[PDB]
Structure formats: structure tokens, C-alpha cells
Design a protein around this nucleic acid. Sequence first.
RNA 1: GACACUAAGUUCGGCAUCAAUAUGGUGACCUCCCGGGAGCGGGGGACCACCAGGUUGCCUAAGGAGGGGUGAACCGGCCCAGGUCGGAAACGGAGCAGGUCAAAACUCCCGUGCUGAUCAGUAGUGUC
RNA 2: CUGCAAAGUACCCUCAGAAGGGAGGCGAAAUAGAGCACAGCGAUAGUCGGGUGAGAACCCCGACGGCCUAAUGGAUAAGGGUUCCUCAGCACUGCUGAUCAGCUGAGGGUUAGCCGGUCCUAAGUCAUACCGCAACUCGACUAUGACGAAAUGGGAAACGGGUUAAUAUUCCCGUGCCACGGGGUCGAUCACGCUGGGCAUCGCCCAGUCGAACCGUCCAACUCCGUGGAAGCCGUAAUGGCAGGAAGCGGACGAACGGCGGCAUAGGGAAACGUGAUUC
Lengths: 64, 81, 479, 17, 107, 81
Amino acid sequence: GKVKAGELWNKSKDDLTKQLAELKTELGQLRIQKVASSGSKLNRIHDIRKSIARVLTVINAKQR
Amino acid sequence: TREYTVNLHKRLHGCTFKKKAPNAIKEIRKFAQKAMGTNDVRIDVKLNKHIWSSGIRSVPRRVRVRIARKRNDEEDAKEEL
Amino acid sequence: RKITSALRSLSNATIINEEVLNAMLKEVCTALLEADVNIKLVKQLRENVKSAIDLEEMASGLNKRKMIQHAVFKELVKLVDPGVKAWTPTKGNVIMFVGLQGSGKTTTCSKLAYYYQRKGWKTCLICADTFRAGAFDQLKQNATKARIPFYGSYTEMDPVIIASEGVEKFKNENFEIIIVDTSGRHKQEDSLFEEMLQVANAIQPDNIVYVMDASIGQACEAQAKAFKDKVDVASVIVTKLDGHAKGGGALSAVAATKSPIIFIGTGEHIDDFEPFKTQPFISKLLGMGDIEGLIDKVNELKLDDNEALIEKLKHGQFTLRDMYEQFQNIMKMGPFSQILGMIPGFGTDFMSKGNEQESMARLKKLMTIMDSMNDQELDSTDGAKVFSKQPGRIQRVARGSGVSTRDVQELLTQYTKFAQMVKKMGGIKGLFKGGDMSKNVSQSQMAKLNQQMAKMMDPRVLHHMGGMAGLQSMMRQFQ
Amino acid sequence: LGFPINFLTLYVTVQHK
Amino acid sequence: RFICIYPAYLNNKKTIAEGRRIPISKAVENPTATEIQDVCSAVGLNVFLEKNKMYSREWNRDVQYRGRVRVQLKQEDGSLCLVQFPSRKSVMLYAAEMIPKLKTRTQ
Amino acid sequence: QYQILKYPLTTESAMKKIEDNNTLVFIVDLKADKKKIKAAVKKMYDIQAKKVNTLIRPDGKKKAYVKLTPDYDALDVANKI
RNA sequence: GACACUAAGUUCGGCAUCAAUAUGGUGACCUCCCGGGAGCGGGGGACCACCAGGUUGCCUAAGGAGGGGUGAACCGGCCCAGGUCGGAAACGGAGCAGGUCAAAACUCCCGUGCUGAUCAGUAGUGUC
RNA sequence: CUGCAAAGUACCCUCAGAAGGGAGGCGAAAUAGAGCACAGCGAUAGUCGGGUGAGAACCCCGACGGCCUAAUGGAUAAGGGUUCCUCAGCACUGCUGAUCAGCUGAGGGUUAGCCGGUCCUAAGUCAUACCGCAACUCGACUAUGACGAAAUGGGAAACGGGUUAAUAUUCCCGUGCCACGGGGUCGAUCACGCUGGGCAUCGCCCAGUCGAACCGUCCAACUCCGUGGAAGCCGUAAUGGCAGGAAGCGGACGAACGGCGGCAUAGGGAAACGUGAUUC
């Protein structure tokens, strides 16, 4: 959602990795509250996973 | 509150012998219920032990029981003497 | 206020951050002054803030974003005060209340008198604000309201005369806490500041409290310094905190005097003195200042409960209608909001986010309706049922309370829903039991069984836990 | 207990105009 | 300066102490401030209806039971507005008599 | 691609293990096993893992009891999350 | 000596206890006025109930204007918080809860009339 | 086949009850309101008070009375598979009842270098090759490889204490360790002492008196060496042994899940926190 496919292709090989490690962190912190209160906002912890999938898919298509 | 001699135990012979003790316990309850209209039938353990003294089959022919009435509603509390 | 939203604004994803910060910083920073605008200060805060960062990290096992806060919050206290205590009293205490015109001195004196009288002290209020003629009557009236005697030390020809009469009155009436309310004066008024110094040398006061308005601006620094250098002043009272001023003046005063901020003036009521210190502002400032509140929950609940002071009434014996008692708590639970009411609804409520007191005025009107009911209806296992079988009774209650027939049925419906969480299990009956044999006494019971040996702080903690009418639900869920 | 009881009490007063 | 006319005044179901001002023989079932105004305005009397006012001796709070009616007797100079209406009693009575005729009641 | 660690397991028992034996409990992936859990844990929380013990469930996940070195010690690592 | 009869003593029970009047009250209800912008202020008649102590009927075997109680969700009277209503206000009104009571009602205990039974066996008289 | 539309039933009475029922409300229609025009057995077992509860013969507490002793006790294999623990329940299940449950619902719970798997090989099995067969998912031999033991085959290494509602040689504390006929303990009994319990005219009756793995050390039997020199002696429960050298004496090798010391001013216990012996 908030992160589209065009925008991912727009980003450099290095920016995908940086964006990747960023999403992982958001995810990890969501899972944390994850085990001891859930603030949230279920739609995102799910989006974080798909976002990460897209980035990895693109990294593969582009050759990194 | 008065002292009373429960026969009705004699009646317990009309039931076979291996079960006389439970029949006994019932007779005492009914005796004290009756005579003694105003008398609920809590049987202190002492009475139970008395009847079961020589086992289920060998109940005595008589027991002396001390019993107490409170007056309002009809209870009774009863023990061995 | 709408920066206090930057708070949750802001808590969300953790996919972004430092920027999130500095903005928020600036953002917060904006909604204030900011640095260099009214003073000068802020640079300092917004500095110290930074300072920390490049010298720290959130102890592991805890999301940074949060931490940031403890620090933010933390610097915020730091900028408008940080507090713990309270004053240490001795056999005999004589204190002065001093400060700028209109800061809240006279009211604070009365508040202090009530606060300590409750602690068992002999207070004597001294109205020595002669310039304002109406001023002596003012403290005289407050004295009557709190039942603290008032000396109108209006022989100002020598401080010496004031000392003489104060000494005589304190001795004859066994007073052990003398509170001298002085007239407001500018920190630069040489004649009046000199008079204050003179009065101090003659009266031999222990404590000199600078009463500072929470809305005070950049000049708080110079004001605190001037009073401190000329009259030795130790300790401060921060008033009008029930307003929405950020209260940065507290940090300014603390920074230049190094004297702790003993008390907080919240409302205009005689008992609205407390104590909280920088913690509540910290909380303030955050969305938890309906967490922090539930200090107010506890702190002011032990109030319940002791020796039945509550006038038997309160939640106690009134506690039978529990329903009457629940209405008092909702009365004191109005009163006024510790935290957001989870409430279980939304349906127009039409914002219905808050009014106090208006919330407490509502409970009082319901109480006036139950004042028209009789013992049978009040102590009935199901009071709503008594009116279903005898609808004539509804008409009478409405007549006596100046309310309509519908208003009484409404109260009855509300009581029904109340008795049901209260019922939520088991309802009314198990809560009343526990409730009539326990509640306070049924935390008291517990209070008496699991106090003993606890100091006063410990007993208030325990009283808050009780409080709980589901802590038993917590404990059983725990298991 | 204090939460619902107090919150229902609260939610009721607001809703009933 | 107009005068006050509460339905209790014209209610044959009320006792003296309950607010009745005219003999039961002339009083009326349950006059409503509205009806009172409707018959007064229709005689040439200057009058306005105070819909929400409530009579102090009126325990009930319903509608049919509340409201107040105001009629001008004299004129700023002093002359009565309608010769046939000196006192207040005069109006009360005139009303008590005309209401049981209102179509809405003969219905 | 699946991640090794899922989330901390917080329970009464997990607390005693943290406080008194100094370990951390996680939910995760089982097939992480056990080495992978040890490495993943280290790199995420910057610590030294001394041992890992693993159990399938039932939950449909896997639980790993990860014991840390004494200087790492564990109450603290868990407090920051 | 032993019995009787009248007077009479003790005790626990039973049944039963008017009528019509004056004066002063309290309450309720009705009916006329004056004043007033409301809540009302002011004044005259009538009826009913009850109370205080006061008569008398020509009244019954007795019948005292005795002493408590309760007062009911409201549905007797007073005082009425709060709230309510009228009022700009001052105030005033209706009035629940609460309190209360010479005077709604309902009830006990007194006394007073007969009256079973009980106990005493004294006072007199009479008999054998 | 809910209904055009959730308008999917507010409020009140009843009930242990968010159940159900009554009344009522919605809609053209609710008969459109939710899968919607019981003794028999070598085990005869309870009784009296009390607790909880709307309700108690059978759920819990106490007392009294009993049942089981190679098992109705303790630990486990297979097999079952969450039946385990907690909380809330009772429409189902329970040979009656149930507030109870192995039932219904929701949560929670199984932690290892030194326990076991895993490794080895057993009867034997499979795979590939070869060959056969019309052919194969078929078939015997021969090769090679692999498989084949969780109480119960072989086998590097752990003990003691503490802790949870539920695990524990795994977690925690402390300490240890590995790899890269005869001998005799428990138990049982006897004797006497100490701790505390029971009974009460006797002086007796009961329970306890503890403490590992491991580390170190010690030995019997068997075998053997030296010495010695038996021509009838040595020895056993019994058979037996000897000049191809018997006994005796002195040695070498050499056992326990055993003794002894440590492990322990570890752990455990309310306390005492033993000592010898017999049968083993």
C-alpha cells in the first residue's frame, strides 16, 4: 500500500537493501509489543510482510 | 434438651444383618424427628461411631442420646451420652 | 495541548525516526514559544535534549522511540520542575508566602492550613497584606471556611508589634504552624522588598515559599532570583496547574534557586493542594496524564477508608444502595478524570470526551432523586423491580425531586445496567457482600489483615489496590 | 471493576441528553 | 403588566387550595392554557400564551397541565380595553363559560 | 523467506527462567534448529548465547529456551522490548 | 368441734364501656369580596371531623373529655434539606426523603360493669 | 427459501442465569426469530457434624468406621494423544444426583554435552548391479551399500539441594564428570540410645533417627610367580588336588549398584539428625 512497486523499482539496489532492513526493523518492533501488548493496527504488520516480499522480488528481477 | 433411649434399633433386625448399621442410623433420625416434633436431625458423629462400633452387622439394641431443640423452626442436635 | 497529540502522533510505525524526532522536537518546540522568542531558555532544553542522545541509548530490551520520551518528559520536568518531597516540620513552624501580585498567595495559605490541619497540626493564618484593604477580609473568610484561625496583623507600625501579637495568639491557642500571607509585590520594588526583608528578620521564619503562577513567562528567572537574594526563600508552590499553561517557569525558578517545589496548586477549591511534582507534568506532558491521574485515583482514595471520616456517607454505609455508593464513586469519580473512561460505548456521545465538573453535577442530581426514595426501595435486592410492581412510587419520587417521570425511569435503567458490571459477575450481590461485609472493610478487612507494619505510603498503595473492585478479577485472571 | 463500572456510568450520562 | 391566568384557576377538578378561583358550578373539566388563550383572543382581548410557565401549586409536570396566559385589561392611559372585562374574575368566568363550546371539545 | 525469531514468549515460567536462570524464551519457526536460533538471537540483541533447548509445541510453532552468558544477563535484554 | 349463709380477701382469665351541648383550638371543604404583574397580601359568611379542659341530659348494670403505641412509599396534621415551581431579586408556593404530634384513622394498657375459675380460709350469723 | 430493509427484538416481570418463559416491540408476514414462503464378583462401606451452593446421600473439611499389601501402593514399555494444570460452566456424557469430572468452553503447560533417541551390529530386511521372466510393482544366488534393538542386546560423561498451578538427573544453586558356595546393599526383623506421637489399671504401641551421582581408596574368588618338599597329606555343600610337586609362607594380576574417606558448616528435617547385629 504505502509502498508501491514503481517506487521500489525507482529505488537503487542499495536503497532497496536499506529499505529492506528498515521494514524488517518495523516488523521486529511490531512483533515485540507483539508478545507484550499489541498497540495496534493489524493491517500493517501484514503489509510489512508483503512490502518485504515485493522488495525481495524486485531485487531478484533487477539482479540486485 | 433431654435424654432419650432409642430403641427403634430393634426394628433394624427386620433388615438383613450385613446392613444393620445404616438402618440404625436412620431409625435414630426418625425417632428424634418424631417425639420431638420440633427436632431436625443432625446426628453428631459420636452417635454414628457408637452404632458402627462393632461393625456394620452388630448394632446395639439401644442407644442413649442427648438431644436439644431450638424452638423456633424445629431443629435438633444430638449426640451420645 | 495539540502537541500532546504529537505524542501518539508520534507513536505509530517504527519504519522512520530521527527525522520523526527533530520534527516533533521543532513541532513541540514550535507550539510552545520556542528559543530565543520570549527568552532564550529553550535553546538550552532543545540542547540538553540533544546532548543526551549522543551520550546514551535506551537500555536494550526496549524500543528507542519510547525511551526518547522518558528523556523528553524527563527534560520537560526539568524545564518547569521535577519533584518528589514535602517540608519537614518541627515543634514550632512559621512560614511566609511571598511573590508577585496575583500569584495565589492568600489562597495557598488557606490551602496549606487545611492540608496541615488534617495532619493534626495547630495552624494560625496571619493576614499581613495591608496595602490591599479587602485583603484581610479575604483571608478571614477563607480561615472560616477551613476553620483555621486568622490574625489580621494590622499593626504595621513596627513588625515588632506583629511579632508580639502572633506570639501571644500562638501561645494562648496552642498554634504550631504559623502561615504569614504577605502582600504581592514586584521583585524590583525596593521599599516593599525591604519591608519583606525586615519582616523576615523580626519574625524568624523557617520556610519562605515563593508562590509562582504556572503561567508566568520569561521573567520567572529574574523574579525567583530577586526574591531569593533578598529574602531568603526556600521552597516554591506552583499554582494554577489546573490550567493549560506548560509550566516552564518552574524549571526557571528551580534552576536559579536550587530549592525544591513543595506543592502544586490545582483548582480553586480549599482542598486543591497536592505534591505530585514534575511527574504529573511529565505525564502532562503525555497522554498518560490520565495514567498519572490514577495517582488521584489512589492518592485521594485512602481518603476513603479511615475512621469513617467520609461522614458515613461517601462509599461506606451509603454503600448499601450498591447503588448509592457506586454513584458516589462515579460523585467522586467525576470528580476529575484519571483516565480515559474505557467506557464500553460510543453513541453520539457527541464528544463526550470530558466535562468534570459537569460529570459530578450529574451524579449529584441522581442522588437527589434517590433522596426521594424510601428505605424499602433503597435497600431492596432489586430496586428497579419495586417500581415495576408499584409504578405509583415512580410518580412520588419524581414529584419530590423536581424531576420528570422519565428521569426516574432513566435512573432506574442506569441502576439496572450498573448492578448487572457490578453484576460483570456476580453483580449485586457478591459485590455488596464482600461489599456489605467488605468494600472498604472489605479492603479494610484486608486493610486490617494486610496493612499492619506497612508505613503510610505502603497503606495508600494497598488502598489503591483495593480500588480494584476487579482486583479480585485481576488476581483470579492471573491464576 | 473500576474501569467498566466507571466507564459505563460515564458512557451512560453522555448518551442520555 | 398584563394579568395572569393559570389553568388551575378554571379547573373544576381542583380544590380551593389546589388553585381554583371560580365556583365549581362555573369551573371546567380540564382547561388548557391554549384553550384559554384561544377564547380570549377571540373576543377582542389582547393576550399572549406563556407555553412553558408552570403554576406553583401544580404537582403534575405533563403538558395538558402546564402553561400560562396573559391578558391586557387596562391600557397605558388607564381605560379598560373592553368595558365588559373589569376584573380578572371577569375573564376567568368568561373563559370558563366559552371553553365547553370550543369545537375541539364538542367533537 | 522466513525469519528465525518470531517473538518473545512471555509467561510466568519464562519470567522465572529469565530472573533466576537468566534465560530468554522465544517462539521461532519450527525448523530453525538450534544453531540457527543461537545465531539469530545473538545478532538481534547483541549477546552471547550459551545454549539453546527447543520444543515443538503444540501451538504449531516451536519454543526455544536460550540461556545467555552471565555478563550478558537477561532481565535487561528483555526489558528493552 | 364439724358443717352452712351474708359481707369479703388472693390470683390468672372472659365479656363489655352512651348521648346531646357552650367556649376556645387544629384540620378539611365550600362560598363571597378588596388588593396585586406572578408566587400571593387582606377580609366575610357555611358545612364536617377531631382535640382541650367545662356542663347536662333524667341517660345505662356500667360509660371517666385517663395513659401509651403506630402513623402507613404516597394515600393524617405539623416542620420541611435537597431538588422543583413563580420571581431580575427579595422572597413565596406545591412538596418527597428526614424529623415530629393536645387534635385523620387504627390500635393497646388504665380505670369502671357483669363474669367463669382459683386460693384463702380471717368477719359476723345459723345449724348439729 | 430470514427479510424489501437488520428493522436480527428496547423496556418490565420471572429465574441460579447474557439460559428459557411471560409481556412487549419490528415487519405485509415471526407457525419469516437465526441449518430461520442399575444386587450376585473374598473389595458387602459408610455414619455424624460442618463448608459451598438456587439446589447436596454420593463436591469439599473434620471425626468416627472400614477396604487394598506383587496390590486399589511406587516407577515404567507399548498403545492413547492433551485425557495433564487453571478458570468458567452443566445442554451432552457419567448405570441415580451433582455445585464434581476423564464431560463442555477458553487459556496455560513438556526447557538436557553427561536420561533416552541418535552410533554399533542380531535374526533378518531393503536398494542398486547382475541374471531370469512375454513382462513387471515379480523371482533365488552373488557382489556393493544401506536398514534392523527407546522397558529388555552393545554403549564416552551427573550428583545433591531448591523451585511451579502444571516440567525437571533438562530450570535455579552448588559441585562433579566426558568428548572433541562365597562376597554383599536395600528391605525386614532383633538389641540399646536419642527425637515426637498414641494410650492410660498395666507399660506398652507407632513413626523418625536421613544424606546421591561422582572422585579416591580397599578386597574376595579365579589365574599365576617364588619359596617350600608332602610317597598320605591338602581341600569342599559336593565334585576334587598333588613329585608333571600338596599344605604352609611370601608375592603379581585382580570385584560389587559393596566398604571406607571426600563430595556436605551441599541438601533435607519439627526434632533427634544413632550404634551393633541377623537373615540378606
